[PDB]
Each structure stands twice: as structure tokens, then as C-alpha cells.
Amino acid sequence: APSFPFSRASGPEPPAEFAKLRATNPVSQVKLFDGSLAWLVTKHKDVCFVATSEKLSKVRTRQGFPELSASGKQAAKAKPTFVDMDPPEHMHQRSMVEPTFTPEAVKNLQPYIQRTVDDLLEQMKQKGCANGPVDLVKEFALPVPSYIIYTLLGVPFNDLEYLTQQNAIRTNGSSTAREASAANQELLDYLAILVEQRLVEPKDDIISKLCTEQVKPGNIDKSDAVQIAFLLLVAGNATMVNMIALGVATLAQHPDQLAQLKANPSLAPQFVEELCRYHTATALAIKRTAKEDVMIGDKLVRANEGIIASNQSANRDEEVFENPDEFNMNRKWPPQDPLGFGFGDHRCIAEHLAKAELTTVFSTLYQKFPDLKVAVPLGKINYTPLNRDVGIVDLPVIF
Numbered sequence: 596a597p598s599f600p601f602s603r604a605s606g607p608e609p610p611a612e613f614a615k616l617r618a619t620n621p622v623s624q625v626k627l628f629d630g631s632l633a634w635l636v637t638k639h640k641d642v643c644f645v646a647t648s649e650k651l652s653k654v655r656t657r658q659g660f661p662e663l664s665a666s667g668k669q670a671a672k673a674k675p676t677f678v679d680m681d682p683p684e685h686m687h688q689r690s691m692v693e694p695t696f697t698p699e700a701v702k703n704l705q706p707y708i709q710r711t712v713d714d715l716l717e718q719m720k721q722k723g724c725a726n727g728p729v730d731l732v733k734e735f736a737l738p739v740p741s742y743i744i745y746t747l748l749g750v751p752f753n754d755l756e757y758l759t760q761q762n763a764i765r766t767n768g769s770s771t772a773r774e775a776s777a778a779n780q781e782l783l784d785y786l787a788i789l790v791e792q793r794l795v796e797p798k799d800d801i802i803s804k805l806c807t808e809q810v811k812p813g814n815i816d817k818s819d820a821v822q823i824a825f826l827l828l829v830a831g832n833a834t835m836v837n838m839i840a841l842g843v844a845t846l847a848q849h850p851d852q853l854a855q856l857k858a859n860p861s862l863a864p865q866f867v868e869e870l871c872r873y874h875t876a877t878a879l880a881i882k883r884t885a886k887e888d889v890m891i892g893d894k895l896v897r898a899n900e901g902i903i904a905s906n907q908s909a910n911r912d913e914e915v916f917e918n919p920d921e922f923n924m925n926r927k928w929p930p931q932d933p934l935g936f937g938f939g940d941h942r943c944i945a946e947h948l949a950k951a952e953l954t955t956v957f958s959t960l961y962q963k964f965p966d967l968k969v970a971v972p973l974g975k976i977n978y979t980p981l982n983r984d985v986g987i988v989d990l991p992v993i994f
């Protein structure tokens with residue numbers, strides 16, 4: 596049984612192990628850091644199965660849950676939020692914050708999203724270019740999702756820049772454990788303040804909604820509200836940043852498609868669709884423990900055994916996506932759902948918001964800067980460590 600998680604084949608590539616497993620051992624056992632075993636599911640059909648089976652659980656206090664790291668096991672001790680709940684608890688809490696993320700609400704947020712992107716682009720533009728190349732991540736990829744989620748949560752405008760930086764420290768590779776923990780606790784303390792403030796004087800934001808609709812009524816307590824807000828913040832911000840950076844790098848890697856996108860920004864949604872399939876920046880979230888014996892393919896997963904369903908592998912499943920390793924924004928999509936945002940009940944609550952942010956970025960970026968170019972050789976891009984989800988740390992660009 597090989598050690599898992601695997602390491603990416605290279606900067607922009609997924610672990611090489613998946614393709615081989617999909618072809619000769621679709622459901623196999625892998626070894627976790629603590630020596631425990633878990634079943635790794637690699638085929639699309641099987642990942643969908645794992646994502647929806649009611650015989651499987653997300654509760655981390657269940658023996659057999661596939662924790663992939665030491666900190667993961669320790670974090671499982673805290674009171675859980677809907678991300679780690681099974682029905683009916685899951686939807687009971689998730690539904691408390693769903694409203695802001697529906698396709699309709701996101702559609703209505705479009706002008707705000709566009710406005711946020713335009714402003715950041717305009718700033719990045721005045722950030723000059725005569726003084727050398729600028730870092731697209733620090734100047735654009737990072738603040739776009741950060742400002743949007745912070746603003747949606749209820750953070751005032753003047754606090755955005757500082758909080759964006761602090762939340763970034765939480766996951767920065769350069770950050771020490773101490774710095775990361777401090778930023779983490781700092782954000783939690785700040786949200787606790789906002790919750791106290793919004794309880795007294797609610798505004799038009801998620802935190803306020805939690806306070807008035809759930810805290811005051813006594814459905815949840817203040818700390819719960821804080822944890823739900825924190826979850827919405829940290830769950831996908833880092834991923835958003837990486838996806839934006841990865842999209843820019845990918846376009847540079849395929850001049851033909853960049854030319855096509857420049858000539859037709861209306862192709863942004865298709866490009867984002869292909870981007871979320873090709874670069875599965877969140878590939879270790881579909882994990883479960885078997886509540887009872889379950890058969891998957893030619894394997895029997897016994898009660899209390901853990902399962903890791905790789906949506907990254909599923910998105911490269913040759914049986915579903917033709918020429919899966921080819922990035923093609925003009926790709927002819929099959930009826931099967933790409934799994935960049937998961938599947939089933941737990942499917943990313945912000946899938947629509949995330950795609951809207953990406954679509955806005957890629958339909959505006961090259962209209963603002965038609966000659967935007969990565970300022971270093973593509974093969975020199977600074978990707979995240981290979982033992983981590985795919986992403987880019989920094990990306991110098993000129994325009």
C-alpha cells in the first residue's frame with residue numbers, strides 16, 4: 596500500500612499514480628501518515644458513488660476517518676460545523692448560510708463582483724509596470740476572492756487589506772506554525788467582535804443574518820456563529836487564489852486559447868469550466884468512513900474503514916472526458932458532471948460564487964490588459980510544493 600497523499604507529477608500536473616490506478620486498480624488501499632489504511636477511489640463513477648452514499652459518513656469522531664495529517668487529527672476534536680456533519684445536522688446548519696450562495700443570489704451579485712475586479716485591476720494598473728513586473732497573486736489573485744468573501748461576511752471596507760494579508764498568512768508556505776496559528780486565532784477573535792457588534796446592530800451581511808436568525812432565537816450560540824463565518828472564509832479562499840493564478844498560467848501555456856479568449860471574452864465560462872476540471876485545486880476533501888459494509892467496484896469496504904474519493908482523478912477519467920489530459924476550453928462536455936466542486940449534499944456551497952468570480956476575472960483581465968504576460972519563463976513559475984494541492988505562490992506579470 597503506497598503512502599498517501601501522493602505528490603504531483605510536476606508543478607502543474609496531478610499525481611502520476613491516478614492514471615495508472617484508474618486503468619488497473621480503480622479501488623485500492625493506500626497508507627496514511629499514521630500507518631492506518633484507507634480506500635482510494637479514482638474513477639468518476641465511483642467518486643460520485645462515494646460522494647452520495649448514505650452508508651458513508653463525514654463525522655470525524657468516527658473511527659476510521661481518513662485524516663491525512665497530524666494537524667488534521669487534532670482539528671477533529673473541535674465542535675464540528677456543517678462541513679463535517681451528516682444528515683440531518685448537515686443541512687440544518689448549512690441551510691442557515693445557503694441563501695447568499697444560490698445561483699440567483701450570485702447572479703445578483705455579478706455587478707458587485709465585476710466592480711471589485713475592475714477596481715483591483717485599475718489599482719494593479721496604477722501599481723505601474725515601469726518599475727518592473729508585478730506579482731499577479733499579491734496584486735490581484737489574492738484580494739479578489741478575499742475582499743468579496745470578507746465583504747459578504749460583514750467586514751468593513753477599511754479592514755479588508757489587513758485581514759486579506761492575515762488570512763493569507765494562515766496558508767502561506769513561508770509562514771511558521773506560530774505565525775499561522777496566531778493569524779488563525781486573530782481572525783477568530785476579530786469575527787467574535789463582529790458577531791458581538793452585529794448582534795446589537797445588524798447590517799446587511801452573513802454574520803448579521805446568523806445573529807438575527809440563529810443566535811438571537813437561540814438556535815446556535817455566538818461561538819457557533821463565529822465558527823460558521825470562519826468556515827465560509829477559510830474553506831475556499833486559498834483555492835480561489837490558486838485557481839485564478841493557475842488560469843493565467845494555463846492561458847499563457849496555450850497561446851491559441853488565450854488568443855481565442857481575448858477575441859471572445861464570452862468564452863470565459865467555458866474556460867472556467869475546463870479550468871475547474873483540469874486543475875482540481877481541492878482534491879482531498881471527499882473523504883468518508885463506512886457506517887456499514889459497502890461494495891465499490893470489485894472491492895468490499897467494511898464498516899469503520901475510511902475512503903478517499905479523488906475528484907482530481909475523476910476529472911481526468913478517460914472513460915468520461917475524452918483526452919482528459921488536454922486542456923481544451925472548446926471541449927465537448929459529456930453528461931457527467933466534472934467534480935472540481937465535489938458532488939452530492941456536501942458539494943461546495945460556493946460553487947456558483949466561485950465560478951462567477953472566475954468567469955468575471957477571465958472575461959475582464961485581458962480586456963483590461965490585452966498584452967498581459969507572465970514575466971518569467973513558464974517552466975519557472977513558482978508552484979505550490981508538490982506534496983500539496985495544485986496552485987501558484989506568486990506570478991510575476993507585465994502588461
Ligand code: HEM
Binds near residue numbers: 827880936
Ligand atoms: C474555485 C474555488 C473553489 C473550489 C474549486 C472549491 C471546491 C470545493 C470542494 C471540492 C468541496 C468539497 C465538496 C464535497 O464534499 O463534495 C468544497 C466544499 C466547500 N467549499 Fe469550496 N471550493 C471553492 C470555493 C469556495 C469558496 C469561495 C467558499 C467560501 C465562500 C467555499 C466554501 C466551501 C464550504 C463551506 C464547503 C463545505 C460544504 C459542505 O460540506 O456542505 N468554497 N469546495
